[PDB]
Amino acid sequence: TGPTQRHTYYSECDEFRFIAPRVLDEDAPPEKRAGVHDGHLKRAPKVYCGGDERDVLRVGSGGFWPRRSRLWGGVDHAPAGFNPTVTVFHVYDILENVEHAYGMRAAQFHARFMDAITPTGTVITLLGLTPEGHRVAVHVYGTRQYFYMNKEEVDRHLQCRAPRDLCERMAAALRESPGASFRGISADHFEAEVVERTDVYYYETRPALFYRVYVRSGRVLSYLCDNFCPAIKKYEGGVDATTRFILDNPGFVTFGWYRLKPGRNNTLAQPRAPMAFGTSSDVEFNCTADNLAIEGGMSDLPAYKLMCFDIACKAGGEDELAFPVAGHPEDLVIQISCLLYDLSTTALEHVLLFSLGSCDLPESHLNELAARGLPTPVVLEFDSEFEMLLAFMTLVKQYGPEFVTGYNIINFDWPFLLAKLTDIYKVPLDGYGRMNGRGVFRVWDIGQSHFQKRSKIKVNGMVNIDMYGIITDKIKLSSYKLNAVAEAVLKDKKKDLSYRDIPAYYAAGPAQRGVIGEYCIQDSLLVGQLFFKFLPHLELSAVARLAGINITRTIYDGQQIRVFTCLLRLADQKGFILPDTQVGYQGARVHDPTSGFHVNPVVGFDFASLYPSIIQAHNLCFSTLSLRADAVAHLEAGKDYLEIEVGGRRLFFVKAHVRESLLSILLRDWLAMRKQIRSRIPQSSPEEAVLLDKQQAAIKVVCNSVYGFTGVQHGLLPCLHVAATVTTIGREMLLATREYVHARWAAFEQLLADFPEAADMRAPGPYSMRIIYGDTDSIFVLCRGLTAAGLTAMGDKMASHISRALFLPPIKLECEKTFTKLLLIAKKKYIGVIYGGKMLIKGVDLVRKNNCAFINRTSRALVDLLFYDDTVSGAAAALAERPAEEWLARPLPEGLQAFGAVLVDAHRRITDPERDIQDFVLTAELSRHPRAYTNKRLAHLTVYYKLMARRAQVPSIKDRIPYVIVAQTREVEETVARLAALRELVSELAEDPAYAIAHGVALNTDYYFSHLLGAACVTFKALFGNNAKITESLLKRFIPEVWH
DNA sequence: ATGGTAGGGGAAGGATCG
DNA sequence: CGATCCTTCCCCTAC
Ligand SMILES: Cn1cc(C(=O)NCc2ccc(Cl)cc2)c(=O)c2cc(CN3CCOCC3)ccc21
């Protein structure tokens, strides 16, 4: 009969816009080859492979790429008698769509589904595979969104006193909509129960009557919540139908192994006829939710496919050496490397090269690959950009990669390709996902927006995992160029590339373009290696399984949604309903440290998950809070509730036995689950142990996300009172721990009394025990008069004692570290030597990946000497012997001599050429869209605008920009004045390392030495009563005066 | 659309004091 | 009236 849901992906083509560089035409004179052919053409798209040629949209007998498709434009490319009986199947992503009965009356669906979607019905499509390998999509009918409204509030506001009345008013309001989107919608299209529920906010709140309204269309529910009755609180109206399908059917997950089973009236699932399919899948199914169950024994992934891909493009305009622009039809996409792996076997299965202008890959590359057990690359030759891109999209649709990865493919690759396919070549994308049409293929940028905080890529049925963000979150670097990341993680350096070199390599011919192919394939291989080292798919799938959210929203839609979903589950379970809404509170207090170098033993105590344990112990929650005394005036204070003053206002938190905290329950259950699964790591195969580790990681993530979720003003379900109470309780606890240690163990008598272990630990000097440092949940205590022999093993017992004697469970204080020497520099900045010989650096420019590697190495060597050299340590002790104030006129002790040496060596490396300029590059992140800036006079901003004027690589909206500092010259000052006049010395001397190396520009030698001295001053002011000016002065005594 | 409060220190520019 | 400070913004940390 034909398809029931029109396939919008191109299966036929007879005429297209042809664009291709004239440089590829050899029979043309070497003079008439500069430009780029552009114009309409009327021939069928074709692709060349190995001397043979075939139409791009030709599918069947002989193909160049692998194909996992069945339907292709109303053709059933499946061997007749293909009726695989499906029992179990794995699910990775979930679609939420609308289906009308009038549309589907052609399809021979059962009566049940047509009743489910009679005017319009929401359908939940589970996508995945069978164990055999078949692509499968099961459609779940019956899922209905629903939201609550107070009955006492609605009855009197809308002059109605019955649920059918509410249905009538809703239908009417939807009729007189702006655009008459819903015309003919009537009251019988809605269901309205009356049910007793409780608002989650505040203990005083008592149950009441709410109208529960069931809605079949996300559009209708959205319009209702937006402008139905704005003066009435609406509950859970944002909950999408997928979340309802997950939570209302207990046991279900968003990622895992399901099984078809018999249903309510002995109902069985029904398989769809091929012409009714709506996916690029081999078999599809219709079923209600009771036809589904979970399968337990199943634990391993199925044969999901992962396409890793990178692209490379070239300009076409007057300047072919400038960076391309996808909006200009002259700049084209020259090459696309695309390699497909199997995710269950982490093995590479196919490698493909899409190229404009046929080529032969270099032989060193081919030899390395074929020797590394990898498959033989297959090159696809194209004459135009349209044919190449169409073939790439046809590959995406036919092979149907369930997962897709690359590097910086969110800000460059996908936007470039899709801008080409959309703005220039005019191609619809709604069918090139998993759905045959009407799908999702959008790409979000930041731009001049306020609400958005992250770039996203969402493709239905296609999980995009950009390894860029993965590395940015998991690894700490100064720059994230793919080759730098490769060398830093895998210790495998590979060739760099720039657009400045691409046109030449293209013009020389098929071999110098096969070089470009080699570079793209090497990039893609490196990305694949990173992917399967960090295993982001398993991590994020475990998070999705835990939070009841699909993999896509797991990745790109924030953290608040996960905590919100779990809390929604628990609150609906326990009788609440979440109301829809839409520097806040005092944080922690860092213990004012008395700075300096400490050589006596230091002990480090800290709390295990301080904020979650506070929430657990004190029963903090939305439902246990109250702002009014009369609410808690009927129970005994202290024994039944906790009175506390937070932010100049009294708060009451009813204790556990009155009303149990929802947050406490979530945290306790998550913690017990984490402990259970971690107890299985030993007696488990490493294959299983990787999954177990990802699981426990996800659990810890959500646990640490609880408090943050509570503290997001104007977020979803916010309650800053809880966050401020948590921080205040933590501050109080730290203060109390300090005072207890001070008062109870001032005398060594008591230290011996409680622990008969300080006998074999009494040091020469006098006994003292005083808190020296503290931050949020940490305590560093000085132990003059004790030996650092078993200070760890006795501080363990100490912390256990303090926890037992001071705090309610599950609050726990542990002894983690004991330092031999420690440098208290300033607030939240310190460096120390652990008793185990390992160094510890926090806060200082050392860890701050914004500085140049040279000053980093130098200051490192300095501190290394300060800790791993006995003479300079005794020298610091000598500096301590005296107040340091007199030393502006006194001499520095001999030990410090070493410093001078290293310092002067610095100067050498600064001015002496043949040094690496990359060893001298600064980095800085570009936070916002530059138009929204308050100073507008920043180094990386100068470099940004300069790169923009030079038609260079415009940095993506949130990367790190590298730069260097020029010295003042005639050209520098002249161009400064010229640019100033055009727009109409301070740190304007900032330049791209690239431009400033090929133009032979010289660095500001004075600046880098002055900042080496500044970093030294900042790091070593501690040893001189923390005075900066005095430290700079007496540091001048390590530098020849001809440099001051 | 959907990520918290503390911090220190560097760059840039205005205000202030003798 | 000229350095000295004093504000503000911005980077990236530690919890
Ligand atoms: C790494 N990190 C990120 C955070 C964050 O992103 N908050 C915003 C937010 C908002 C909504 C959601 Cl859903 C999720 C997250 C933190 O808040 C944070 C806090 C601590 C304090 N620690 C923790 C426990 O005991 C006391 C000391 C330590 C590390 C932290």
Q: What Å value separates CA A945 and C1' C2?
A: 35
Question: Residue A558 falls within a domain, yes or no?
Answer: yes
At residue A430, the 3 state secondary structure works out as: coil
Task: Find the nucleotide nearest A778 (Cα to C1′).
Answer: C15
Among protein residues, the one whose CA lies closest to atom 16 of ligand 1 = A708
- Listing DSSP states for A678-705 in one string gives HTTSTTS-HHHHHHHHHHHHHHHHHHHH
Q: Which of residues 759-788 of A touch strand C (CB under 7 A)?
A: 775-778
Cβ-count burial A478-493 (b if 16+ within 10 Å, e if not): bbbebbebbebbeeee
Among protein residues, the one whose CA lies closest to atom 23 of ligand 1 = A611
Question: Residue A463 falls within a domain, yes or no?
Answer: yes
CB A991 within 8 A of CB A1001: yes
For residue A674, give every residue at least 6 positions away whose Cβ sits within 8 Å of its Cβ, in sequence order, or none: A696, A699, A700, A703
For residue A602, give every residue at least 6 positions away whose Cβ sits within 8 Å of its Cβ, in sequence order, or none: A772, A780, A781, A782, A783, A818, A819, A822, A832
Q: Which residues pair with A442 in a beta bridge?
A: A458
| Measured distance CA(A701)–CA(A683) in Å, rounded | 25
Which mutation among A474, A705, A712, A816 tests ligand 1's pocket best, with the greatest number of atoms within 8 A of CB? A705
User: Long-range contacts made by residues A691-696, C-beta under 8 angstroms, separation at least 24?
Assistant: A691/A299, A691/A538, A691/A542, A694/A535, A694/A538, A694/A539, A694/A542, A695/A542, A695/A546
Does the C-beta of A1026 come within 7 A of strand B?
no
Centre a 10 Å sphere on the Cβ of residue A827 and count the other Cβ atoms it contains. 14
Give me Rg for the CA atoms of chain A.
34
Task: Find the nucleotide nearest A843 (Cα to C1′).
Answer: C13
* Number of Cα atoms under 13 Å in the Cβ half of residue A96: 20
- Listing DSSP states for A256-317 in one string gives EEEEE---TTS---EEPPGGG--BS-SEEEEEEGGGEEE-SS--S--S-EEEEEEEEEE--S
The DSSP symbol for A578 reads P
Q: What Å value separates CA A294 and C1' B17?
A: 78
Closest CA relative to residue A652, chosen from A632, A630, A623: A632
A114 and A41 assigned to the same domain: no
DSSP H or E run through A369:
helix A363-371
Does the C-beta of A262 come within 7 A of strand B?
no
- Among A713, A728, A756, identify where a domain stops: A713
- Listing DSSP states for A149-210 in one string gives EEHHHHHHHTT--SHHHHHHHHHHHHHT-SS--S-S--GGG-EEEEEEEEESS-SS---EEE
Q: What is the CATH number of the domain that holds A981?
A: 1.10.132.60
A664 and A653 assigned to the same domain: no
Closest CA relative to residue A659, chosen from A622, A628, A629, A634: A622
| Measured distance CA(A277)–CA(A894) in Å, rounded | 84
Q: Helix A662-678 and helix A610-617: axis angle, to 10°?
A: 130
A284 and A427 assigned to the same domain: no
CB A736 within 8 A of CB A624: no
| Measured distance CA(A973)–CA(A969) in Å, rounded | 6
A796 and A729 assigned to the same domain: yes
Phi then psi for residue A958, to 5 deg, are: -145, 35
A745 and A790 assigned to the same domain: yes
- Listing DSSP states for A808-857 in one string gives -TT--EEEEEEEEEEEEEETTEEEEEETTS-EEEESSTTT-TTS-HHHHH
Domain ranges, residue A937: 922-963+966-1002
* Number of Cα atoms under 13 Å in the Cβ half of residue A217: 17
A291 and A309 assigned to the same domain: no
Parallel/antiparallel/unpaired status of strands A922-925 and A839-842: unpaired
Does the C-beta of A1029 come within 7 A of strand B?
no
* Residue A618 CB-density burial (10 A; 0-12 exposed, 13-18 middle, 19+ buried): buried
A176 and A296 assigned to the same domain: yes
| Measured distance CA(A10)–CA(A27) in Å, rounded | 33
Does the C-beta of A454 come within 7 A of strand B?
yes
Does the C-beta of A983 come within 7 A of strand B?
no
| Measured distance CA(A42)–CA(A13) in Å, rounded | 9
- Listing DSSP states for A911-952 in one string gives HSSSS-GGGG-EEEE--S-TTS-SS---HHHHHHHHHHHTT-
Q: Which bases in strand C are touched by protein, i.e. have an atom under 7 Å from a CB?
A: 8-15
CB A533 within 8 A of CB A489: yes
Report how many domains make up chain A. 7
A777 close to ligand 1 (CB < 6 Angstrom): yes
| Measured distance CA(A941)–CA(A924) in Å, rounded | 9
* Cα separation values, A976 from A969, A979, A990, Å: 11, 5, 11
- Among A301, A320, A336, identify where a domain stops: A301
A359 and A459 assigned to the same domain: yes
Please state the length of chain A: 1044
Question: Residue A150 falls within a domain, yes or no?
Answer: yes
Among protein residues, the one whose CA lies closest to atom 10 of ligand 1 = A708
Parallel/antiparallel/unpaired status of strands A403-406 and A305-314: parallel
Phi then psi for residue A16, to 5 deg, are: -155, 165
Phi then psi for residue A60, to 5 deg, are: 150, -135
Which mutation among A590, A704, A816 tests ligand 1's pocket best, with the greatest number of atoms within 8 A of CB? A704
Does the C-beta of A829 come within 7 A of strand B?
yes
A710 close to ligand 1 (CB < 6 Angstrom): no
Q: Helix A897-911 and helix A853-868: axis angle, to 10°?
A: 170
* Number of Cα atoms under 13 Å in the Cβ half of residue A243: 23
Question: Residue A200 falls within a domain, yes or no?
Answer: yes
Q: What is the 3-state secondary structure (H, E, C) of A307-331?
A: EEEEEEEECCCCCCCCCCCCCCCCC
Q: What Å value separates CA A703 and C1' C15?
A: 16
| Measured distance CA(A1002)–CA(A964) in Å, rounded | 10
Does the C-beta of A936 come within 7 A of strand C?
no
Q: What is the CATH number of the domain that holds A310?
A: 3.30.420.10
Q: Which residue has the tokens 């079949």?
A: A216
Q: Which residue has the tokens 């059933």?
A: A76
Closest CA relative to residue A247, chosen from A22, A696, A569, A653: A569
Phi then psi for residue A499, to 5 deg, are: -70, -25
At residue A53, the 3 state secondary structure works out as: strand
CB A924 within 8 A of CB A940: yes
Q: What is the 3-state secondary structure (H, E, C) of A1-13?
A: CCCCCCCCCCCCC
Q: What Å value separates CA A733 and C1' B1?
A: 36
Phi-psi region of A346 (alpha: psi -120 to 50; beta: other; left: phi over 0): left
A560 close to ligand 1 (CB < 6 Angstrom): yes
* Cα separation values, A1007 from A912, A997, A1010, Å: 15, 18, 5
- Listing DSSP states for A64-127 in one string gives SS----SBSSS-B-S-SS------EEEEEEEEEEEE-HHHHTSS---HHHHHHTSS-EEEEEEE
A291 and A369 assigned to the same domain: no
A23 and A97 assigned to the same domain: no
Task: Find the nucleotide nearest A935 (Cα to C1′).
Answer: C9
At residue A801, the 3 state secondary structure works out as: helix
Question: Residue A270 falls within a domain, yes or no?
Answer: yes
* Cα separation values, A517 from A169, A184, A410, A926, A1004, Å: 64, 58, 21, 31, 40
Question: Residue A142 falls within a domain, yes or no?
Answer: yes
Q: What Å value separates CA A940 and C1' C10?
A: 11
| Measured distance CA(A412)–CA(A311) in Å, rounded | 9
How far is residue A101 CA from its own chain's centroid?
Answer: 40
SS3 percent helix, strand, coil of chain A, rounded to 5, is 40, 20, 40
* Residue A447 CB-density burial (10 A; 0-12 exposed, 13-18 middle, 19+ buried): exposed
| Measured distance CA(A608)–CA(A610) in Å, rounded | 6
Question: Residue A761 falls within a domain, yes or no?
Answer: yes
At residue A348, the 3 state secondary structure works out as: strand
Does the C-beta of A934 come within 7 A of strand C?
yes
At residue A958, the 3 state secondary structure works out as: coil
Tokens of A917: 């300029």
Does the C-beta of A379 come within 7 A of strand B?
no
| Measured distance CA(A734)–CA(A750) in Å, rounded | 22
At residue A1001, the 3 state secondary structure works out as: coil
At residue A795, the 3 state secondary structure works out as: helix
Cβ-count burial A687-719 (b if 16+ within 10 Å, e if not): eeeebbbbbbebbebbbebbbebbbbeeebbbb
Q: Helix A560-574 and helix A686-710: axis angle, to 10°?
A: 80
Does the C-beta of A925 come within 7 A of strand C?
yes
Q: Which bases in strand B are touched by protein, i.e. have an atom under 7 Å from a CB?
A: 1-13
Question: Residue A889 falls within a domain, yes or no?
Answer: yes
A441 and A513 assigned to the same domain: yes
Task: Find the nucleotide nearest A1028 (Cα to C1′).
Answer: B9
Task: Find the nucleotide nearest A1017 (Cα to C1′).
Answer: B9
Q: What is the CATH number of the domain that holds A556?
A: 1.10.287.690
A1024 and A883 assigned to the same domain: yes
Centre a 10 Å sphere on the Cβ of residue A773 and count the other Cβ atoms it contains. 23
Q: CA-based angle A79:A85:A87, to the nearest 5? A: 145
- Among A713, A738, A756, identify where a domain stops: A713
Method: X-ray
Q: Helix A686-710 and helix A536-547: axis angle, to 10°?
A: 50
Does the C-beta of A589 come within 7 A of strand B?
yes
Phi then psi for residue A439, to 5 deg, are: -85, -160
